[PDB]
Design a protein around this ligand. Structure first.
Ligand SMILES: Nc1ncnc2c1ncn2[C@@H]1O[C@H](COP(=O)(O)OP(=O)(O)O)[C@@H](O)[C@H]1O
Ligand SMILES: Nc1ncnc2c1ncn2[C@@H]1O[C@H](COP(=O)(O)OP(=O)(O)O)[C@@H](O)[C@H]1O
Ligand SMILES: [Mg+2]
Ligand SMILES: [Mg+2]
Lengths: 174, 57, 450, 58, 451, 185, 171, 91
């Protein structure tokens, strides 16, 4: 190590505390899920266990099952993914150390913001690296790649404000 | 508007008798120093000699 | 020190014992010792205690011989702490009477200075190892301030707490210094105006002075007039920090003020023979004196101001006045998020600098727009909004008010008022001056005085 | 009493506010008398200081 | 082996130096940010100091500081071996990623250098105290004071600190002589092209902040563009425009209409006859012969971006003669978006600092509040700059544009505009009358009778 | 005294005062600026070690003190300063009197006599202080005051006793407070 | 210069020297070069200055050969800044007349486009590291705007001050 | 049993009714979460000189883990620095 902060800025922006708070609030309160669902996505979580937990909780919510600690632990155990997540010990730690009486919206927004900033930084790094190593690509190809990579960040929304629709769909609806 | 209100209040107080107080003032200032530069320098030198450890130059 | 460094802290017990023994045996040499060494220059607690008790007895009118000293120590219960009558008798006996105590006192004086320098070096190293949230600028400022306090002044200790004896000596020295040079009622830097001198006794050292006014009231003009008067009536350098104007315009205004030549002619160059002669005389006087320094840098921080002021004081052995115009343009990068904290830090740093260099610091400031909506537009302290700490920390506060700025009908054309909003050590009131905007000058008011 | 009426005074104020920008000072303006000077200058100062409307000006 | 008990010289970071040097190799536009945060003496190893010195020299000469250029410059002077060679330079080029937070690394290097130098100076002072070697106390105190004062060294060039009155007096005499050498007929700064404005303002003075304010449709953009055209024609230095309001094409169309004196509607609709085409051709020829006008039509600019672009233009073309911003109600300070007054104060402060730094006149356009339309007299005043008291405080010159025909259809002053000097710091105030030809988008000298 | 224009009686009084002070020798002054609580504690400990204890510690004023690690937030800095001062007072077993300043909004109220809430930005000061006294002079705000020369010490919080107002006579000519000899209610 | 993993901004000094020498030797091909490259595409200040002066001379109706170009530069005092008559003569001589300046002009092309793309990526990363009060939505909008502007007609750099020649062409 | 004493921010005094609530433990969320019993002390005579409840203090149970919540009234003898059982009517 030998690093107070010299190697502490290679770390992409993130917040473990907000993730744990959101997961604990979801475990101890299943009525706010939609509020969490409209602000965060499974890919906004920095660690693999948190993404897996959020995906399993979304699946259980869509299947109608409760997403409490016991049901989630049992569902993970049946699929054999409990060991990969971190165990029932880690699940109970998330459930207990994180209070139920909290405002999960702020933590969800915090998780959303860090993911956007980190993905933007990573996309900039990829664009610069591709620029320094063309590997036979022309300038137009590199520009198109950069444009697609940059606009793929704000994209990838499950279902929220579908946006502009062609006149054909609106005419069919009418 | 404040001046009109103050005039009304003062007239009401006057018509009800009362006596207007005569400020308060604040102390005299004293004075009367028949002391010049040479005598005050002698006084400072005397204080220095009496207290010794002044070390002032 | 013997071989390599053995007597590592510079000290000499033999010299202290000889001095104390000689003072016990010959009380008439005390004065010669009292002007060469202080109590704090002694290394051991018993020697400091003995020297303090002897000084107290001597200034109370009593002999400081062995028996009297022991009796005085016994009454206060401090004889055992010193070492006892045995140790006092040892001091009396071991040191021969026939001694040259002046050399020993000088030796004790020097070792203390070297040891205190080593102490300040150790403090600097310790502060460097454990910053405790301090930036590099803060650490450099601390080190420079400590070493400057060591070197520039008398070769004395660090800041520290001081006994009442030293402070009393300093106060007597201040009184004598103010008396030795008759300035006719002026104790600080002469402002050049008689009524302002009467009300303020000049610009006092170690005081924070604020000059505030609405735009185009003559704030910069008044500050520059004060700077010119301080330069002409004093020998110490005068330093100017200007984030508002380039130095060339400052010098053109100064030439117009000193030579009494219309500023428009100087700016456009349309001068005549007499004006050229006046300008030549002014330039000759300025180049003969050479004690005005101008810094027209932009984006100044308090650390830069303090560092440059210390550098100037090192170069020329002291400063006479510092002027800043103005504080609403200064920056504190570490506190850019909140402006109020930035202003408070600026005010505190300016006060600390004024206290450290023993110079008057005059900082210019602006007021709020709501002042123009009142029935009477003369400024008050509350018109310093966003700068409550400025009102709390300033030693002197002067507002500039020209009635012709707001009213064209004003009967007070050419008349300006300096309003003392806060005078910490004196009265407050209004001083009238004449404003000649043609020469960018303020002058003594020659009209009748109520 | 060679004083103007309200309408004449308002017209004088309007002409002054139009034309005074071309003179070195308020005393350089071609005043008819001292009363006109004082009235027009006071009204001009009051209007420009308190944001008076036309009815308030009258 | 060195255990945790290694506490002799901690304060350094080789990784931060390598990151800074690699980032400077990969991105040359960051140099200024590195230059303000670190110096060549903050580096611990000799090769890093040599590399930074060579890069600073190359940046001063205007050359790029990439890998190949730096290596070629070093090889010419024979200093390539001292650095470590093209092998070490290529290692730095390869290892450093594009994900560089160069400012943070530079700050880390700066802090470590200061701490290390302070510790070393303390050690020197203490060791000198323990070993006098015949020096007196005053000599030791002077040595300590000199050592402590010598630490604070900044890369700022001359005129950084206070200046003796002799040098400033020499500069003033030189300025007076320079003004007397070339007869500009009472103009000491940038010529405005109008005689009365030149008489009242003596041109646009360098290091001054100039504000032009008016209600909408009064002609702020027209007057600003006329000033830009006059400055470009009557000078040799580049003139920079920051147009956050209009695209550059419309600005150039207005400029062509003004310079060639062709009707603006004809140019906009393309209905031009032969004489108009000849005029436009002559104007374009003159403009392409001069080549000293630069336009930036980006929107939402922060003061930092304005300063950076102005510095880049001045560096590329050896100076600036005038900077124009239209307008400051479209500029953004994201850190102060909550409070408008603080944002305006920051913008005005940064503009004044930039004007003083680049020694160029900076003109910024501004808008007035609606309440002005309710007063009996609608001519602007200083208090009509609501939410912008700092603008009134910081500006060296303030001019308002007023057209009576805008508010009064039956006005007797049609075609006549007034420039009202609401505040001049080094001159008088008053009203200057001009003729407004909206057909050509032009202001002209008023030929009518003068009172 | 400040201008040096004294007569023989004044010089005799000053000489007597200086003699008494030099006979006592128990007053120490430190005029440093920007002191942290650590430096204050260290210097107080050094004084107590050298001279066998302390009887009183006085600070003027706490708004000028600095905590570099907490310069970002003023409330946390004030809380840390107050906590450190309380710890020092308990450690040395001495009374510590620290001067403070009040917000400007006090001057906008109908009655300008200070209250606890006027210690705005310094709630921890109200929480931690054992005794809180406010100085109020009516003549400062009102020129036509009937209480000229009379000052009020208002005990805003006493932890182990009552609260109320104490009237004193203010002699600014001598820079002194004296016992109030007027009628008492 | 092994170029086995080196990260160097894309540029080719040889192409610039060849283009400048060919334009010096044959002024008639200037148009064939003026449609393919601009002054900003050059990587060094001397080359940009030379190209700008040659464009000014050519559009003012004058030959752009070595002697005339040197004389025009000397009258403005900018000959020393460029590198001198020695450097101009080296450019004229070293580059052979029998060259295809079209390929070299297309080389002084898109290399500048890739350099601009790298600059835009660096600006995006720098803005991401220091938000300065910007929200994530503002940063995303800024990045999208920059990468959208750079990928449209590639007339010049992402955004900045432009010489009046480009603006006049657009008008 | 561990009884730790805490203090409340001045924001509580910005409400018309100054009786403390759980949300008044702002900046101490961990304290609110980890606490098994939470009791607030209130005295009306402190805020109002002319209060009718002089010498009466309220203990308000803001959070009980294993029981109900409510207000308990007591007599406060500050002369002896003591609390005593309330002999008046209870509500
Ligand atoms: N050339 C000049 N002739 C006459 N008066 C001038 C001249 N230049 C400035 N002034 C006067 O100086 C005043 C403002 O001076 P200054 O103190 O520099 O500005 P501020 O008060 O904003 O600091 C203005 O009221 C103006 O009348
Ligand atoms: N073709 C034209 N003929 C006459 N006047 C015009 C023409 N085009 C614009 N104008 C005038 O220009 C004025 C606005 O110009 P501009 O400076 O863009 O306004 P702003 O004050 O918003 O900058 C309008 O009042 C309009 O009368
Ligand atoms: Mg000024
Ligand atoms: Mg416009």
């Amino acid at each position: 190590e030998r690093d107070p902060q010299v190697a502490g800025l290679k770390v992409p922006p993130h917040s473990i505390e907000a993730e744990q708070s959101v997961l604990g609030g979801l475990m101890l309160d299943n009525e706010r899920w939609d509020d969490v669902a409209e602000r965060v996505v499974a890919d906004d979580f920095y660690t693999r266990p948190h993404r897996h937990i959020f995906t399993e909780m979304a699946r259980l919510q869509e299947s109608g099952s409760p997403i409490d600690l016991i049901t989630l632990a049992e569902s993970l155990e049946r699929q054999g993914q409990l060991d990969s997540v971190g165990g029932f010990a880690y699940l109970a730690e998330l459930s207990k150390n994180t209070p139920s009486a909290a405002n999960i919206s702020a933590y969800a927004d915090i998780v959303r913001e860090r993911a956007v900033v980190r993905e933007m930084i990573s996309v900039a790094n990829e664009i610069a690296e591709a620029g320094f190593d063309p590997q036979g690509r022309t300038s137009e190809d590199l520009l198109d790649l950069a444009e697609s990579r940059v606009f793929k960040i704000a994209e990838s929304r499950a279902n929220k404000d579908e946006g502009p629709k062609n006149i054909a769909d609106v005419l069919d609806a009418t | 508007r404040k001046a009109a209100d103050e005039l009304v209040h003062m007239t009401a107080r006057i018509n009800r008798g009362e006596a207007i107080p005569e400020p308060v003032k604040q102390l005299p200032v004293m004075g009367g120093r028949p002391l010049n530069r040479a005598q005050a320098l002698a006084k400072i030198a005397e204080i220095k000699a009496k207290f010794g450890l002044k070390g002032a130059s | 020190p013997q071989v390599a460094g053995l007597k590592v802290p510079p000290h000499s017990i033999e010299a202290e014992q000889s001095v104390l023994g000689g003072l016990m045996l010959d009380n008439e040499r005390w004065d010669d010792v009292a002007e060469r060494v202080v109590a704090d220059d002694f290394y051991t607690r018993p020697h400091r205690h003995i020297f303090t008790e002897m000084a107290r007895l001597q200034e109370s009118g009593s002999p400081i011989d062995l028996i009297t000293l022991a009796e005085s120590l016994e009454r206060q219960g401090q004889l055992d702490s010193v070492g006892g009558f045995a140790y006092l008798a040892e001091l009396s006996k071991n040191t021969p009477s026939a001694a040259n105590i002046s050399a020993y006192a000088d030796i004790v004086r020097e070792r203390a200075v070297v040891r205190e320098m080593i102490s300040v070096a150790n403090e600097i190293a310790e502060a460097g190892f454990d910053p405790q949230g301090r930036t590099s600028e803060d650490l450099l400022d601390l080190a420079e301030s400590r070493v400057f306090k060591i070197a520039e002044s008398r070769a004395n200790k660090d800041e520290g707490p001081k006994n009442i004896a030293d402070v009393l000596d300093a106060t007597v020295a201040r009184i004598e210094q103010l008396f030795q040079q008759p300035h006719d009622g002026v104790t600080g830097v002469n402002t050049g105006y008689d009524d302002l001198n009467k009300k303020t006794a000049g610009l006092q050292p170690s005081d924070l002075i604020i000059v505030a006014a609405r735009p185009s009231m003559g704030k910069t003009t008044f500050a520059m007039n004060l700077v010119e008067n301080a330069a002409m009536l004093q020998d110490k350098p005068v330093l100017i920090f200007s984030l508002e104007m380039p130095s060339e315009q400052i010098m053109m205004r100064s030439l117009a003020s000193l030579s009494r030549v219309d500023q428009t002619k100087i700016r456009t160059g349309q001068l005549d023979d007499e004006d050229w002669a006046r300008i030549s005389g002014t330039m000759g006087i300025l180049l003969e004196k050479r004690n005005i320094y101008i810094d027209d840098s932009s984006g100044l921080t308090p650390t830069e101001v303090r560092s440059r002021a210390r550098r100037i004081a090192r170069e020329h052995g002291g400063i006479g006045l510092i002027m800043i115009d103005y504080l609403q343009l200064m920056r504190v990068p570490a506190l850019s998020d909140n402006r109020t904290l930035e202003i408070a830090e600026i005010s505190r740093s300016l006060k600390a600098l004024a206290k450290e260099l023993n110079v008057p610091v005059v900082a210019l400031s602006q007021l709020n727009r709501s002042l123009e909506q009142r029935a009477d537009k003369r400024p008050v302290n509350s018109d310093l909004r966003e700068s409550g700490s400025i009102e709390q920390d300033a030693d002197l506060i002067m507002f500039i008010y020209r009635d012709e700025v707001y009213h064209e009908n004003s009967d007070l054309k050419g008349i300006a008022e300096i309003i003392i909003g806060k005078q910490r050590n004196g009265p407050i009131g209004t001083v009238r001056l004449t404003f000649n905007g043609q020469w960018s000058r303020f002058d003594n008011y020659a009209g009748p005085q109520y | 009493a060679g004083l103007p009426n309200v309408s004449e005074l308002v017209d004088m104020v309007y002409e002054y506010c139009r034309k005074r920008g071309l003179y070195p000072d308020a005393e350089s303006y071609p005043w008819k008398s001292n009363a006109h000077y004082w009235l027009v200058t006071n009204l001009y100062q009051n209007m420009r200081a308190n944001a008076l409307t036309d009815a308030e000006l009258r």
